[PDB]
Design an enzyme around this catalytic site. Structure first.
Site, PDB file in Angstrom:
ATOM      1  CE  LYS A  10     -11.105 -25.159  34.737  1.00  0.00           C
ATOM      2  NZ  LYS A  10     -10.325 -24.064  34.117  1.00  0.00           N
ATOM      3  CE1 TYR A  14     -12.002 -20.794  38.424  1.00  0.00           C
ATOM      4  CE2 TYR A  14     -14.303 -21.338  38.097  1.00  0.00           C
ATOM      5  CZ  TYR A  14     -12.968 -21.622  37.904  1.00  0.00           C
ATOM      6  OH  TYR A  14     -12.604 -22.741  37.192  1.00  0.00           O
ATOM      7  CG  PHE A  36     -12.059 -13.520  32.647  1.00  0.00           C
ATOM      8  CD1 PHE A  36     -12.210 -14.493  33.622  1.00  0.00           C
ATOM      9  CD2 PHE A  36     -10.899 -12.764  32.643  1.00  0.00           C
ATOM     10  CE1 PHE A  36     -11.231 -14.693  34.582  1.00  0.00           C
ATOM     11  CE2 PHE A  36      -9.916 -12.962  33.602  1.00  0.00           C
ATOM     12  CZ  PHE A  36     -10.084 -13.927  34.570  1.00  0.00           C
ATOM     13  NE  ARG A  72      -1.583 -24.663  39.440  1.00  0.00           N
ATOM     14  CZ  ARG A  72      -2.417 -23.665  39.162  1.00  0.00           C
ATOM     15  NH1 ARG A  72      -3.726 -23.821  39.312  1.00  0.00           N
ATOM     16  NH2 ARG A  72      -1.943 -22.507  38.734  1.00  0.00           N
ATOM     17  CB  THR A 129      -3.107 -21.764  33.752  1.00  0.00           C
ATOM     18  OG1 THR A 129      -2.836 -22.181  35.098  1.00  0.00           O
ATOM     19  CG2 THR A 129      -4.553 -21.304  33.643  1.00  0.00           C
ATOM     20  NE  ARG A 186      -5.051 -26.701  32.394  1.00  0.00           N
ATOM     21  CZ  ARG A 186      -4.797 -26.352  33.649  1.00  0.00           C
ATOM     22  NH1 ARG A 186      -3.545 -26.173  34.053  1.00  0.00           N
ATOM     23  NH2 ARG A 186      -5.797 -26.171  34.502  1.00  0.00           N
ATOM     24  CG  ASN A 221      -7.827 -24.478  31.516  1.00  0.00           C
ATOM     25  OD1 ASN A 221      -8.943 -24.776  31.928  1.00  0.00           O
ATOM     26  ND2 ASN A 221      -6.979 -23.737  32.218  1.00  0.00           N
ATOM     27  CG  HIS A 253      -9.490 -25.955  39.343  1.00  0.00           C
ATOM     28  ND1 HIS A 253      -9.178 -24.619  39.461  1.00  0.00           N
ATOM     29  CD2 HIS A 253      -9.380 -26.480  40.585  1.00  0.00           C
ATOM     30  CE1 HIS A 253      -8.886 -24.351  40.723  1.00  0.00           C
ATOM     31  NE2 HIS A 253      -8.999 -25.466  41.423  1.00  0.00           N
ATOM     32  CD  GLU A 289      -9.433 -24.560  44.642  1.00  0.00           C
ATOM     33  OE1 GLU A 289      -8.981 -25.649  44.245  1.00  0.00           O
ATOM     34  OE2 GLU A 289      -9.075 -23.464  44.156  1.00  0.00           O
TER      35      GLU A 289
END
Lengths: 149, 149, 149, 149, 149, 149
Positions: free
Chosen positions: F10, F50, F58, F86, F92, F103, F113, F116, F127
């Protein structure tokens, strides 16, 4: 700080798991990544990239090796990034390179020297135009620009 | 790519927890580990290793220090591995060594310079024969040999 | 602090250039390396090592893989080194392992899980006796022993 | 081994998250940290530090930048630590520095070169006296002193 | 993001050359260093720090060990930095800690667990007041604050 | 070993200089990079990515942040790469993540964070189709495939 250079991780660098470390050398130095893609380019593109070497006996084998796996193509931007990028890569022949450079840390054979970097500002411009569509260069400003310059 | 050199992590390198990092320098470069053992060799073996220095005033103290803890003895194989191995180790006197080499990263005193590397092909052959039984050299082929050479 | 365990870097760990990093995990933790050698052991030795699995369908293939390249055999010494060594290696199946462990950082397949560690004090004793001649264990005292314990 | 030098991580080094790495270079080399503090010193102190440059056109801007964030001030001790410390930092102008040094790994602009190191034994003494109260230097003995020297 | 915690590298962490790595864990996470000094504090200060343990049989030996070398005292600032700092340090007993934490990477013995972190917000406030003069906390803003929060 | 997942660094990860380290986590694990590009995608693409969150309060701010700098988009391939990816990224919410994950090493705020990862095989397929043209996925075979599997 607007100078740009073309850095490519060659198929041997990709195969040997060196994408992360190589990126980190440029990233940690303070240079800005403005373009990147993993590509397996056509033979014609590789022949144009090495056009200045087309009459060398090793040209066909060089092209074949550059076709033999994926390449991580990058454009990096910053002051003196062409020459300093070459310094970070180390001598083209790893036997002449200094530990602490990419080739001095990771490579042995000039024919398997893990990465490419433009050798001049003008050749960088030609290589950037060859490997990237103009829209693939990303305009952004680093949060630490004023701490690097 | 068949040249071999003897690299030894000296007792100070072992004591200071540098086995892993030193191995990694050679491993990451692309050289092939063909022999290794942790050893506390007899005094006679260390005196033979440094036979060319037996008339130096520092010889007894050098031998005593080399007996003062374990040694990680290694044989590494690859193109120009003797000279490039010396380059990776850095100057024998760490004060003259370059950051990015083993001694330029980890050592200060020429008498505590963390590691040994053969200084020539012929001396490498003698040192390999001295420190290893011939059956301790392992014949194998790296999965990335054709990507390093 | 006298407990010992057998840790072996399997042929896939050697092939993938992980000797240095794996050694560093144990070295940085404060454990003491008391034996090490690079070996290509006989089939009989590998069959004895995995004797408890000799009736499994995967036994022949496991033995063949363990013969397929060199192994870095080690004895490490320190408090709770058997169980903590297993914790450093991570779950035997890398899919169940935690990032930060050897397998959680470096491995995917339970059949290519990079390393072995004794699963108990008694099995460690048997494995040490199997893989090392008694004289290959080195008695020494770490300069930082009183700072680790 | 009693020589001392003043090493300071400048505001750009702090801002860019380089405190740990820079400390590690000196720590891993074998030098002894005898003083350290994070400080935002008064302008008068920075003007005295750069007193030899007070007539340069860049002096006001240099002082302003050195006031623009925190500084990690350190005293390191060991043989030849002034000159070897300068070697670890690399050339004052990062464009002239070697990869493997702090500036050759982390910096581009001479005006944002991440760190300062005393340029001579006498200037080190003056800088130590300027930046530290005498009681802030800590007398201790490294557990590995006799393995470094 | 204004919460603060006291993190101290204990004499064993300093002796074993872990200042850089420990700082890097907090620095890389995104926490802000707002105070730091290398100190050899008086016995009275250490007895006050461990006042809650003054009736334990191990109290005298704990105080003696904490006096036995320098300590790197730090204040770190950020969201949940007390609890997340404890998580980064790992379990107080390294035998119960996870690889990837400071103690799970670097320590074995609960009595030589390399570092201290405040166990609560209120205890952090008391420890910060004990170890630092109020003027030693540095007010600054990270260039990447808005990218961390 | 043919499963694929979408991993994106990100804008905060790019800004904070984490491209190299993040790539290295997946590369060192043994997963295969089959697509990568640095991109500043259109708002419509981020809103589609998203889409399942379009009714959250948000959402507008999340989209604005994802537009605020470049993104390093990647497709990684290997056994269980969705779920293990993950696990490598960590929870997350970085406050719930384990040190040793991306993270848990690099992030604090759930809204910053750093990266993704697809949360399921089917969402990974969606995706990958959203972020990459089909021709941008590169077919190749790792030299160490048979040592990883």
């Amino acid at each position: 700080s607007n100078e740009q250079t073309f850095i490519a991780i060659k198929p041997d660098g990709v195969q040997r798991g060196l994408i992360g470390p190589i990126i980190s050398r440029f990233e940690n130095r303070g240079f800005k990544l403005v373009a990147m893609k993993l590509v397996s380019p056509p033979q014609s593109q590789l022949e144009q990239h090495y056009a200045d070497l087309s009459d060398k006996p090793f040209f066909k084998g060089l092209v074949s090796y550059m076709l033999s796996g994926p390449i991580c193509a990058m454009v990096w931007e910053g002051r003196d990034v062409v020459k300093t990028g070459r310094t970070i890569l180390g001598a083209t022949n790893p036997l002449a390179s200094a530990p602490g450079t990419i080739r001095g840390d990771f490579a042995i054979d000039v024919g398997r020297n893990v990465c490419h970097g433009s050798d001049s500002v003008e050749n960088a411009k030609k290589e950037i135009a060859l490997w990237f569509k103009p829209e693939e260069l990303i305009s952004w400003k680093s949060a630490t620009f004023d701490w690097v310059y």
